[PDB]
Amino acid sequence: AFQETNPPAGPVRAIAEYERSAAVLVRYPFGIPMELIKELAKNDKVITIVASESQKNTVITQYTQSGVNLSNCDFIIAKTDSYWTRDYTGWFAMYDTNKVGLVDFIYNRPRPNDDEFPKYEAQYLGIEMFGMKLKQTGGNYMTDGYGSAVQSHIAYTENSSLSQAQVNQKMKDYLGITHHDVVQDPNGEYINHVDCWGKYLAPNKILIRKVPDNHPQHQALEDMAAYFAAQTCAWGTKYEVYRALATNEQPYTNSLILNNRVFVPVNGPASVDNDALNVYKTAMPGYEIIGVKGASGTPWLGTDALHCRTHEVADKGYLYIKHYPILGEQAGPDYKIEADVVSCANATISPVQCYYRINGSGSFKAADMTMESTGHYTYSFTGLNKNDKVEYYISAADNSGRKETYPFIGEPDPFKFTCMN
Ligand code: NA
């Protein structure tokens, strides 16, 4: 059964989908097209859940026949009731300064093998599992990686024996969430997953579904988009709100961000798909945006598509860069950057650099950041002139062979600010 545990030793920080992923978790019998599994396995580890050695051999034959990169295919043998790995698998969080853990919860649907599955996931990854006593659904959860999470109103109505404050406190204790944004549902739907209408694309970017003016959800979604555009995000700027127009219930927000690739389910028409992919491409410079057609037997649905049938897996040895950027004309008066870098592999970190460029001229220059205290690195931009334009990003490496940048995509989309002092 679900086993409640004490919460993880603090501080805790839930890991966002756009942070480094060591793998992606899918399930057999499949709910996704083989073409998607082949694309995933080209660059990333694909973990497939199977119920037996027999099913594992069936899957290996299908992957071989389809030309899947078998060197990137791993398996977990466990019973499951469904292929909605988004919804019942564990949630990832960093805790105890430099550990990666899994958070289990009471799955909100009567599928006991799905509900039990996180134990097998933690065992496979060799990480600790914590049991947060809330009725939850992964499809209805997203975090920005800076302590905010968005969920539909189901997060309170399915935990109605607790007060909202008790629900928020569990999210704080197990996932480090300091703003549990459970948004109102004016239509009070029986099922309402945030990934059907909203998606953080970055700490400062959110995609909100848009529908035609006469659709019954038109005003509710316009209100949601205005709510996010009017408020401050983790980086101190307003959210950038992007809109994916669903003319006919296309699940365009139900995408998967996996490292530098974004897999977007597409159902047509082709012009409306192209418009939606161009919103993702505009929102996420440097990323590879891939439209993915559905499998004929298990097609994408408006309320259930690619994000619902995948789950990114964090890196147990994550080389994590925590940084709040200095941006625009609001970067001063102190043009000093700070980055906290920790190795969850307990590896030796070296080097920690600021790569920067002035007025878009020449190659990026690397400067070693000063380690003022353990895990705390700084760099001051000096000798700049009024109205100079800066691009910069953070780079770190460790002796486990990990290499990371902040932002994740690195040099293709660095942080930008203007010298106003
Ligand atoms: Na569970």
Residue numbers in the entry: 44 to 464
Please give sentences taken from the publication describing this entry.
We solved three distinct structures to high resolution from different protein preparations, which crystallized in different space groups: substrate-free (to 1.5 Å resolution), a substrate-mimic (1.4 Å), and a substrate complex (1.8 Å). In the substrate-free structure, which was obtained with DTDP-treated wild-type (wt) protein, catalytic C351, nearby C239 and distal C462 residues are covalently modified by what was conservatively interpreted as a 4-thiopyridyl moiety. The C239 side chain is even found in two alternate conformations, one bound to thiopyridine and the other with the sulfur as sulfoxide. This indicates overall flexibility of active site residues in PPAD due to the absence of a bound substrate and suggests that the covalent modifications of the Sγ atoms do not distort the general unbound conformation of PPAD. In addition, segment V226-V237 of the loop connecting blades III and IV, hereafter the “Michaelis loop”, is in an open conformation, thus consistent with a structure that can bind a substrate. In particular, Y233 at the most exposed part of the loop points to bulk solvent. We hypothesize that DTDP-treatment precludes substrate binding and, thus, protects the unbound conformation, while lack of such treatment causes the enzyme to trap substrates or mimics during biosynthesis or purification. In the substrate-free state, the Michaelis-loop containing Y233 is in an open conformation, which enables peptides with a C-terminal arginine to be accommodated at the active site. D130 becomes rotated around its χ1 angle by ~60° upon substrate binding, thereby exchanging its tight hydrogen bond with T180Oγ1 (2.6 Å) in the substrate-free structure with binding of the substrate guanidinium group.
Uniquely among microbes to date, P. gingivalis also produces a secreted PAD (called PPAD18), which protects P. gingivalis during acidic cleansing in the mouth through ammonia generated during host and endogenous protein citrullination. PPAD does not require calcium for catalysis and is genetically unrelated with animal PADs and, like the latter and cysteine peptidases, its main catalytic residue is a cysteine (C351 in PPAD20). In contrast, PPAD citrullinates C-terminal arginines like those generated by the prior action of Rgps17, which may be facilitated by the surface co-localization of Rgps and PPAD20.
